[PDB]
Amino acid sequence: EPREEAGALGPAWDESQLRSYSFPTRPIPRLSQSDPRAEELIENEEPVVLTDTNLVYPALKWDLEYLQENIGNGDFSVYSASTHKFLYYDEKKMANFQNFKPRSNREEMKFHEFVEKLQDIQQRGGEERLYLQQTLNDTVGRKIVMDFLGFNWNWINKQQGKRGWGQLTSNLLLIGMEGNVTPAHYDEQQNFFAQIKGYKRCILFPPDQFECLYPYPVHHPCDRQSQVDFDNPDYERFPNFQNVVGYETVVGPGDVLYIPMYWWHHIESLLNGGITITVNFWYKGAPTPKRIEYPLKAHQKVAIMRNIEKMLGEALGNPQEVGPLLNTMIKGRYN
Template identity: 60%
Template sequence: MVDQRVWDESQLRKYDFILKKIPRLPYDDPRVDEMIAANQPVVITGSRLVETAEKWDLDYFNENMGNDNCTVIYSRNHKFKFYDDSKASPDIKAEFTPTRKVSMKMSEFVRRLKEWKKGDERMYLQQVLNDTVGQQIVNDFLGFKWSWVNNIQKRNSWGSLTYNLLLIAMEGNVTPCHYDEQQNLFAQIRGLKRCILFPPEQFDCLYPYPVYHPHDRQSQVDFDRPDYTRFPKLKDLRGQEAIVGPGDVLYIPNYWWHHIEALMRGGYTISVNFWYKVGRTGKVAYPLKGYQKVAIMRNVEKMLVEVLQDHNEVGPLLRSLVVGRYTE
C-alpha cells in the first residue's frame, strides 16, 4: 500500500517557472484568518473537516455508492482541461483534443479503474455530493465539521455554499491551469496532490482564452511545452505550490489561477471541494486589487461579445478603442 505522506521529486512534473511554498498553518493559528481575509492561499492543517471520510476508498464507494450514477471524464492523455460544450462553435479553431464526459455507475468506474492499463484512456470522476448518493456516504458527509467552515464563511462574508464536488483522480492526472469565480476550500482525503497557484495579478502572463471559448477561464499555455515566442510574458510567471495530503485543507481564493496534479506513482486520490459564492465587494477602493481587475475585464468582455454578436469583432474594437488613445 502506498504511504499517503511519503513522496519524492521524481513524482512531480518539471516546469520552468519559479515556485515558492504556500504557507502551512494549524487551523487554530490566527494567521489563517488573516490570510483568508486577505485572499491569500494557505494550507490549513488539523481542522478535521473531513475526518468522517477518512475511510473512503474504492471498495467503500463500491459498497455504499455502487449503484449510483456518477460523472466521469475521459482524456486521451494526463490533462483534463475543462471543455464547455455549450460554447462549442465550428469557427473556433480546435488546438486540443476535448475531453469527453460520460455517466456510469460507481461500481463500473471502480472496476475500470482497477483494471486500467497503460494505453487506455485516463479517467477522472467528478461528482456533486448531495442527498441522492448512498445513505452511508450522506451520513459521512453530514458528519463533516460544518461548524468550522460555516464560521469561515461568516467571518469573511462569503455567499452561500454552491456545492461540494467529489473528485477521484488516477495517479498522474492533471487539471491544467485555470481560475474560478468562487471561493474554494479544497479538502484532501486520500493520496497526495500538488497544487500550483498564481495570483490574479499575473493574468497577462497566463494568456487566458477569450470568454466565448469552450476553454474560458483557462490558460492557453501548455506547462509541459511552454511557447515563449507565442506567450512572451510567460517568462515573468511566478507561483506558489503545496503538496496536500489527507486531512489538509487548501484555501484557493477566487480568481487565483491553480494547476492541480495527482502525484505520479502515488496511487489514486480522493478530494472534496467546498465552493462558496463571492460575497459583496463593497465600495471600490484604489488601487484596484488583482481579482477586481479580472472581474471587471471579464464583465467588459462578456458585454462586448453579447452586444456585437460576433466574437471576431471584439479584438479589433478593443484595439481601436485603446491604441493611440490610451497608449503612448
C-alpha cells in the first residue's frame, strides 16, 4: 500500500496512478540499510528497497531549474516516442535486423534544449513523450560535481567490497515524464537504483521466469527485452506469460532499489505524478568462481543460453541462421 509523507501531507501517491496488468505481484521488502535482513537479501541476490542510505542525499534538491543552471553544456541523449512505451534497444545490433524500425527516436541535445522542448510539449498540450538518459561524465558543472562527491560512497563502496563486485561501470542520469514506461528487460550488471524526484513503480521478475517473458534473440537490437506487450499480451505466442509473478514496489525520493543482475525489471513513472529523476549505479558482477557448484543458479543457465546463441551466430557466419539450426536440433529429438 502507499506510504504517507511526513508532516501529515497525505499519501504521496494512490493506487489510481498505477497501470493495470494481467499478472499478480507481491511487494519488495522496504528495509533500513542497518537491517540485517537487508544485507542477507543483497548477499542472496534478491531485490530490496533501502529507505535510509542517503546514497544520493545531496541530489534530492535537484529539479530542472537547478540542473539546467549547473549541469554544464554537454550533450544529453534524449529519447522520444509517440507512445508511453520507450523501447530499450541497441543501435549496434541494428545491422543484423535491417527490418526493425525503432519507435523511439534518439536525439542528442543540450540540457536547456531538453527543458525547452519539454516546455513546448506542455504548453501546446501535445502527446509526445521524452526520456533523458545520459551517462554522467566529466562535462558536468562544479555544483553538480560537488553533489556527486557528496553521495554516500562510504556505504556503496562497502557494498561493492562485501559482494566482490567489479568496478562501478557507470552512473545514468534519468529524467522522464509522468506515465513513461521502460519495458521489461534484464541487465548484465548489478544495479543500485537511487530515486531522486517523483515516484516510479518497479516490477521485478526473478531470472528463473525466463520461460514466461520470452526475450528477443541475442542478436536482435532489443536483446534482453521481453517480447511480450504487457498492455496486450499475446497468449498464443507467449503462453507461459500467464504464469508470470512479479515483485513490486514504488520508490520515491530517498529510496534505493537493489536490482540484482539478470533480474527482469519493468519501470514506469507514475501517472500524473510529474517528472521523475533517478540516478542508477551499475557494477560488474563478481567473477565466476573457479569451482562451479551444482545445481546451477537460474542466472547461470541464462548465461549459458546467451553464450550458445552467440557462438552459433559466430560459427554459422550469420545470426539469421541461428533460429533454423536450433529448430533442426530439437524438432523430433528433444521435444
